[PDB]
Amino acid sequence: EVETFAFQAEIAQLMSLIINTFYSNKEIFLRELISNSSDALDKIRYESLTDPSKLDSGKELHINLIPNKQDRTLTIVDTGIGMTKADLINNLGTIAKSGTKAFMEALQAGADISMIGQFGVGFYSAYLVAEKVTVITKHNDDEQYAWESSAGGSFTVRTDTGEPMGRGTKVILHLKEDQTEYLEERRIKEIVKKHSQFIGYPITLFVE
């Protein structure tokens, strides 16, 4: 069963801005997603010090970058803390409303699209390069979900019946037809080397 939800008007606005504004420096989407994964991994690691059983769903704390040309997807996989249904539908959600607003205001004031991360909404930078984003995620306290949006003002969530992931998050970027350079090994290596050099987790770039 697939549930369909309306983004709040402000997030829809933001998504449309990212999609519509002419902005050539798109590569920053990857720094933002890697950094999102890094924060999710910090959080699970932190929680684990006071409750070791939080790691029963897997001990390795890592980030995998997985390009697939047949499918035209770039997937960022982490084993961080994962997201609950309430995060997907409500909490993220509420936090994104105020980051959006602040980010909008700063843009009017000459700030730049690359600064999206300072406003806690870097995940939406994925729409610089993706026509569709699917997010698979498993939190310890909850079941595995698939969230999905091509923007246009709505998203879906359903319980996921794919390969079970243990704990973590997979962001599957369905790339715009003119953004396939982000499937290329030397392009991804360049981008990681330039913006994500000091991430405190191993980042494995899978080959095709």
Ligand X SMILES: CN(C)c1ncnc2nc[nH]c12
Ligand Y SMILES: COC(=O)c1c(C)n[nH]c1-c1ccco1
Residue among 9 and 86 whose Cβ is closer to its own copies:
86
Flag whether 56 is marked binding.
no
Residue pair 105/134 in contact (Cβ under 8 Å)? The answer is no
Per DSSP, the three-state class of 201 is: coil
- Residues 50-69 contacting its own copies, CB under 8 A: 50
- Interaction between residue 32 and ligand X (CB under 6 A): no
Largest CA-CA distance found in the chain, in angstroms, rounded = 47
- Interaction between residue 147 and ligand Y (CB under 6 A): yes
Q: Count CA within 13 A, CB hemisphere, residue 13.
A: 13
Residue among 12 and 111 whose Cβ is closer to its own copies:
111
DSSP codes of every residue in 113-135 = GGGGGGGT-GGGGGGGTEEEEEE
- Interaction between residue 7 and ligand X (CB under 6 A): no
Which span (17-25, 108-116, 120-128, 192-200) binds ligand Y, by CB under 6 A? 120-128
Which span (3-11, 79-87, 178-186, 191-199) binds ligand X, by CB under 6 A? 79-87
